[PDB]
Design a protein around this ligand. Structure first.
Ligand SMILES: COC(=O)c1cc(-c2cc(-c3ncc(CN4CCN(C(C)C)CC4)o3)c3c[nH]nc3c2)cnc1OC
Length: 863
């Protein structure tokens, strides 16, 4: 049909890769992935189009609740009915539930319209005016993020009564169209030749080859003979490994590194020994290599798509048997693993086992004790599953079958444990399957929190069709916000050759599951394409004329019909709940920094003040580290709020959308410390002493009794960011990358460097901020020590969730961020949270660092 052709061309444009390219590979693994995932996503779409109207509100507008509310006071609210020019303003309590507010709005309508209504409060939901956000369910108004926000900023919540028939019309309009174990001989390969090799002709070419199960060697590495450097080297030699063909585990990867010797790294390539249908690979393989920036076991197991320029290694996998050989089925593995001797051990060694399972590297004897006592690990210490998997000999089929037998009856583990099991340190497919099974209980809020890490984990997958891909696709099709962010994390990496195929395939599958969301995302892509062209113009014009001239030309370009159309009426890529309605051209500008980022403002008559939102478009810088830093700060905020600690943080949106391209959220009514300290004349903040500048500026935005609250917001947020930058090792902090809101809230921007990348970033206490905390007084120990108490409380809360931060950062090593690429980076976090200590030892150590920072601050106070 014409529609099928149209959807295919629309998916090709959205994902940034023509669907015909997938067909041209003539790859049965790619073909099977496309078929099975299309069917799976089409089933999810059919389940969706028939949801009840409240279930469809949960899909499209998942509730945004306060972290404390997950798992009294007078309040003024403005309520109108859909398509009404008339609204009603009434008093409710923060403890009241949406239904009581709805019943109240219905009584007011019945009185004003002089008729007894047919409608009951149960037939409606409350939309947040001009936003894709709703208040529904049995939660008090204060438990909703929107009301909580209105309450702290003093503003009046504006809501719209939306009838179930209107929600159903949305549902309807948004519808998709109508045996191995006998093979004892050592594993071996034939290294035939190399093609398109480039290196110094004075050198020799060597091929280092290794067998791996994740990062662990299955046997020692084997190297070729040294052959003269030339474009087409010829080895035609046998490389025999110290492992039997029967002992190769299911996820065994064969890793290669081509290099030059007088070391000079040239290229690397990896491949799985068994294909996607569990068959042991035989025959010739031409491996298109990746250039080395020597073995790379974590590297992708798919060849370099750039066959024209890539170095190629031709290898031969020998026919081990006259018939095809498959990895044994689970029932065959369970039969072998079912037999084994159960460990009977003394109370003295039982004390030692409990000591090492609760304790982290182990000694060789401590490993044998864990392995011998594996049944006791399962029955009494099930959370120690990861330790047991790390002592298992993955290069011995009987040990693997015994481990697999126990795993197949292992109790489901907490989400924290399951996160650890997704690391490349647990490469087995059954371990991966078990980790997903324990993650199915993740709430949509917890999943959204860890989505960025789960997407990075995809880069560790050995095959296209995997449990993690299906898990992420099913959760994305069941929650529109999850779907939104899954698409953007995949899309923003389509320029990376190693992931373009996998990521391209997942995005096609998602689009099959939601035709309407594909068109919504295409409209975002159209706006981003215009912003790129607009930004290129600005970068050029900025080197030739004055800012007033570049700014006027920018506005003229935005006022073109194609730009007004493409830049208006879209869901924000930073937050699909935020609607970017009318682009306010007069308010748009660009920033004076290197990449000249665009500052784009929007307004919405339907949303009132809440509709006044902006986005910063930046091109030329990689935004992945900023996003990760901000998500870690947002996680800290959630963890603190769960302990009743609100440090008034500003975790603003930051989202990579393409190659060195992305969006950053505009925080209105905010300015940098540097701009405020310029201490300009004929201003309400002009100071007698530059130290008075921040406090005068706060005084001008908060007259009378409001000043005390602004100083309190400043103190709380300063404690949060002092702790956050210390734990994350955020250095290069100055007056131009620290901002303050009119409310008093301090926040950081532009997170270029973290994890002390290499020197230990000390705790930072700046005098200018000590001056506001102390209310402009030289000595105010009462206020300064309340601030120290907020720092200590914030730090001790984070420490308790230390393992969560460690598991998440470990998953992030897959991202390929230069500041997060080894054990040394994770070690930094281990030191900053001082996790190898008691809470008393860590707090004493934190106080030493905090006191070391105040002495450093005093070298400015004495001046
Ligand atoms: C240097 O630029 C970047 O590369 C960058 C910027 C931000 C940022 C800045 C402001 C911000 N800078 C200065 C201001 C204050 N002025 C803004 C323009 N106003 C005019 C148009 C009236 C005057 C006040 O703000 C951010 C503000 N919200 N979010 C920001 C992110 C975040 N990450 C960044 O890189 C990752």
């Amino acid at each position: 049909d014409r529609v099928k052709k149209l959807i295919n061309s629309q998916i090709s444009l959205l994902i940034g890769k023509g669907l015909h390219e997938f067909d041209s590979l003539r790859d049965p693994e790619v073909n099977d992935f496309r078929t099975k995932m299309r069917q799976f996503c089409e089933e999810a779409a059919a389940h969706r189009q028939q949801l009840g109207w409240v279930e469809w509100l949960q899909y499209s507008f998942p509730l945004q609740l306060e972290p404390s509310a997950r798992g009294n006071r007078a309040l003024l609210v403005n309520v109108k009915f859909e398509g009404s020019e008339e609204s009603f303003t009434f008093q409710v309590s923060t403890k009241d539930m949406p239904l009581a507010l709805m019943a109240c709005a219905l009584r007011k309508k019945a009185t004003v319209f002089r008729q007894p209504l047919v409608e009951q409060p149960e037939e409606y939901a409350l939309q947040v005016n001009g936003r894709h956000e709703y208040l529904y369910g049995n939660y008090p108004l204060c438990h909703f993020q929107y009301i909580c926000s209105c309450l702290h900023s003093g503003l009046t919540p504006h809501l719209t009564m939306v009838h179930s028939s209107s929600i159903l019309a949305m549902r309807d309009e948004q519808s998709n169209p109508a045996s191995l174990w006998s093979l004892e001989q050592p594993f071996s390969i034939e290294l035939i030749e190399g093609r398109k090799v480039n290196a110094d002709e004075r050198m020799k070419l060597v091929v280092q080859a290794g067998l791996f199960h994740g990062n662990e060697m299955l046997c020692k590495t084997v190297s070729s003979s040294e052959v003269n450097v030339c474009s087409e080297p010829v080895w035609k030699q046998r490389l025999e490994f110290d492992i039997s063909v029967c002992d190769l585990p299911r996820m065994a990867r064969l890793c290669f590194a081509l290099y030059a010797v007088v070391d000079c790294p040239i290229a690397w390539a990896n491949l799985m020994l068994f294909d996607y249908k569990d068959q042991l690979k035989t025959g010739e393989r031409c491996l298109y290599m990746w250039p080395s920036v020597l073995l790379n076991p974590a590297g992708t197991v798919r060849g370099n798509p750039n066959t024209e320029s890539a170095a190629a290694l031709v290898i031969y996998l020998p026919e081990v048997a006259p018939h095809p050989v498959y990895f044994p089925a689970l029932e065959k593995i369970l039969e072998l693993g079912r037999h084994g001797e159960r460990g009977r051990i003394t109370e003295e060694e039982q004390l030692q086992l409990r000591e090492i399972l609760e304790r982290g590297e182990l000694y060789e004897h401590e490993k044998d004790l864990v392995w011998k006592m594996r049944h006791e690990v399962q029955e009494h210490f099930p959370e120690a599953l990861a330790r047991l998997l790390l002592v298992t000999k993955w290069n011995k089929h009987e040990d693997v079958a015994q481990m697999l037998y126990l795993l197949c009856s292992w109790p489901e583990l907490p989400v924290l444990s399951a996160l650890e099991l997704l690391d490349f340190s647990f490469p087995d497919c059954y371990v991966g399957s078990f980790a997903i099974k324990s993650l199915r209980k993740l709430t949509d809020d917890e999943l959204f929190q860890y989505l960025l890490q789960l997407v990075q984990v995809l880069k560790y997958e050995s095959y296209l069709d995997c449990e993690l891909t299906k898990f992420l696709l099913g959760r994305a099709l069941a929650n529109r916000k999850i779907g939104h962010f899954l698409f953007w994390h995949l899309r923003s990496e389509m320029h990376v050759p190693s992931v373009a195929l996998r990521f391209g395939l997942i995005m096609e599958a998602y689009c099959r599951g939601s035709t309407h969301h594909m068109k919504v995302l295409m409209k975002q892509g159209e706006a981003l394409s215009k912003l790129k062209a607009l930004n290129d113009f600005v970068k050029v014009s900025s080197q030739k004329t004055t800012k007033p001239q570049t700014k006027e030309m920018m506005h003229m370009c935005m006022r073109q019909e194609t730009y007004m159309e493409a830049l208006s009426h879209l869901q924000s890529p930073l937050d699909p709940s935020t609607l970017l309605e009318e682009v306010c051209v007069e308010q748009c500008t660009f920033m004076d920094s290197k990449m000249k980022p665009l500052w784009i403002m929007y307004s919405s008559e339907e949303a009132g003040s809440a509709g006044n939102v902006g986005i910063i478009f930046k091109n030329g810088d990689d935004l992945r580290q900023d996003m990760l830093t901000l998500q870690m700060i947002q996680l800290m905020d959630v963890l603190w709020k769960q302990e009743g600690l609100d440090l008034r943080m500003t975790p603003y949106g930051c989202l990579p959308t393409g190659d060195r391209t992305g969006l950053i959220e505009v925080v209105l009514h905010s300015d940098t410390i540097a701009n405020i300290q310029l201490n300009k004349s004929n201003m309400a903040a002009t100071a007698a002493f530059n130290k008075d500048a921040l406090l005068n500026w706060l005084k001008s935005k908060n007259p009378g009794e409001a000043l005390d609250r602004a100083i309190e917001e400043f103190t709380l947020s300063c404690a949060g960011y002092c702790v956050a930058t210390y734990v994350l090792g955020i250095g290069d902090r100055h007056s131009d990358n620290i901002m303050i809101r009119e409310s008093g809230q301090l926040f950081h921007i532009d997170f270029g460097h973290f994890l002390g990348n290499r020197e230990r970033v000390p705790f930072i206490l700046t005098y200018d901020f000590v001056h506001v905390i102390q209310q402009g007084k030289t000595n105010n120990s009462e206020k300064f020590e309340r601030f120290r108490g907020y720092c200590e409380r914030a730090y001790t809360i984070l420490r308790r969730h230390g393992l969560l931060f460690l598991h998440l950062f470990a998953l992030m090593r897959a991202a390929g961020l230069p500041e997060l690429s080894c054990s040394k980076d994770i070690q930094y976090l281990k030191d900053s949270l001082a996790l190898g200590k008691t809470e008393e030892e860590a707090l004493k150590h934190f106080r030493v660092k905090f006191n070391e920072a105040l002495r450093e601050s005093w070298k400015t106070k004495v001046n």
